[PDB]
């Protein structure tokens, strides 16, 4: 536990047994060893590059899997020149602070009010992607029916159920961080959310 990684409390998937979870601090390079065992491995992803510069936005894998210069064969970022259209709306600096007191996870009433108002100003199907399920709960409580069907991802609920329910009847869909690589298709390949609302950037909590 102490030597490296994160400590936590676990509840086993089957039989729901209490446990004390720790992180193996030397199996991080074993996966890299495992990849290199293959004749030639290729790690590809849509968000692997933090930045737009290949040789400075890729060190998260270089360090996480332990890859030194032995295993940096090529680092390239390929994105389409024009793929779809993106309009951007942002909360300026004067926008209310999200957490009045983030240490106790308290969302400021001003920011919640503004988020509720802006969500109520939408006129088409939309996918709100919160960070926490607590935030989902608070925005759902403050927000009401806005002429757009509301849908909520309950804590632990598999996103398949919520997405299937929301597909047939589109509208507001609040999803927490449980959805990481699942997007709601329109059941025939068409976009069914003109608006994608990130209420707050999913900042990770401090790890003391």
């Amino acid at each position: 536990g102490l030597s490296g990684g994160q400590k936590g409390v676990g509840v086993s998937n089957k039989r729901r047994e209490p446990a004390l979870i720790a992180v193996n601090p030397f199996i991080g390079m074993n996966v890299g060893r495992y990849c290199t065992q293959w004749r030639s491995a290729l790690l590809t992803s849509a968000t692997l590059s933090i930045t737009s510069t290949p040789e400075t936005g890729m060190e998260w894998l270089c360090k996480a899997l332990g890859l030194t210069s032995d295993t940096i064969s090529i680092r390239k970022i390929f994105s389409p020149d024009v793929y779809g259209s993106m309009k951007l709306t942002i909360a300026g600096a004067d926008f209310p602070k999200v957490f009045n007191d983030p240490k106790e996870q308290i969302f400021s009433g001003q920011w919640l009010k503004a988020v509720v108002e802006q969500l109520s100003c939408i006129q088409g199907p939309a996918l709100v992607l919160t960070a926490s399920h607590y935030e989902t709960r608070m925005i759902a409580n403050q927000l009401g029916e806005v002429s757009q069907p509301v849908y909520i991802q309950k804590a632990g609920q598999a996103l398949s159920e919520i997405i299937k329910q929301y597909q047939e009847k589109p509208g507001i869909l609040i999803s927490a961080g449980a959805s990481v690589g699942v997007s709601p298709r329109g059941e025939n390949g068409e976009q069914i959310f003109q608006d994608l609302i990130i209420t707050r950037i999913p900042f990770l909590p401090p790890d003391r």
């Binding site: 009045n100 308290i106 969302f107 009433g109 919640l112």
Partner: protein, 342 residues
Amino acid sequence: MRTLNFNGKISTLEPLTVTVKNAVSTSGHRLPRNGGFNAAPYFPGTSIRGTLRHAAHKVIVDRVGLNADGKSPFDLAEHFMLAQGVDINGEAETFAPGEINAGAELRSKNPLISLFGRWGLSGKVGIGNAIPDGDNQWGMFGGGARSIMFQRDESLMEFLETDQVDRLERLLEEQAEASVDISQIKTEQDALKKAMKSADKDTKAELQIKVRELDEKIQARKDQKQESRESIRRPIDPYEAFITGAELSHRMSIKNATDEEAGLFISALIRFAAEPRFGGHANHNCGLVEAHWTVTTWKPGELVPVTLGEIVITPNGVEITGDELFAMVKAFNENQSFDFTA
């Protein structure tokens, strides 16, 4: 003039408690935590230092002696100077140029003030904090509930007159009605107190104002009550204290201690051992301790210390070991040239 380090351990024969204003919060009585909230608590060196300073003050009072009616020659200002280092007379500077060398003569003629300093004069004695050796050596003690005597025992009712029984009846009726009213005030005011957490900073002032007026309303509801002011029936909140048998490592240092100053300190320890009480909650007999200290000297320039002896304070007695400590105590006792009215 040599440095004496008393390194040792204090066992807690009874629970050991203290109430430091910064340490305590709205939650309840809590010991200071030697760090952040969840850090291991320590007994303040301040309470220990004050206890031993008062013990030394009483030692000096007895040494000077009392006249036939039993009063001490010292002025009240001198009592305060000796035991608390407050010059109520109203003159003690620090950088007085003429007081540059008066410190030496003052220390020689006033061993207590030398030992325990004052405003402007350094204190040769430094009493460290007492920190528990092991874990879980502290807990909540003394929690309870003040009840009504006549309701716990009915034999006390045959002692009261009919008019007094009626007074108790009115007291209990006022208790019940005012308590339900105060409970309603408390529930509504904590209902809006939890709205403080998520509130605009401008509205936080209004929330504080509303809480303050509701507290004033509580006070008014208690004031209109006639029979009693404070509720007889009440749970007494427990206080945080070290467990019985808790072993706390303790460290003291008399810097450049003369023979007479160290002797006075040892006499203070001896007289303290008569009532080995540290801290508060004398009710519940908190503070009784069994402390043993090894006195070690360290001549500057030497690579190792020399253990002069050990001071063991136990409920069965005070054991002084080592000829050097006996010599210091004897030198302090036999030195008649002290003037504490300086």
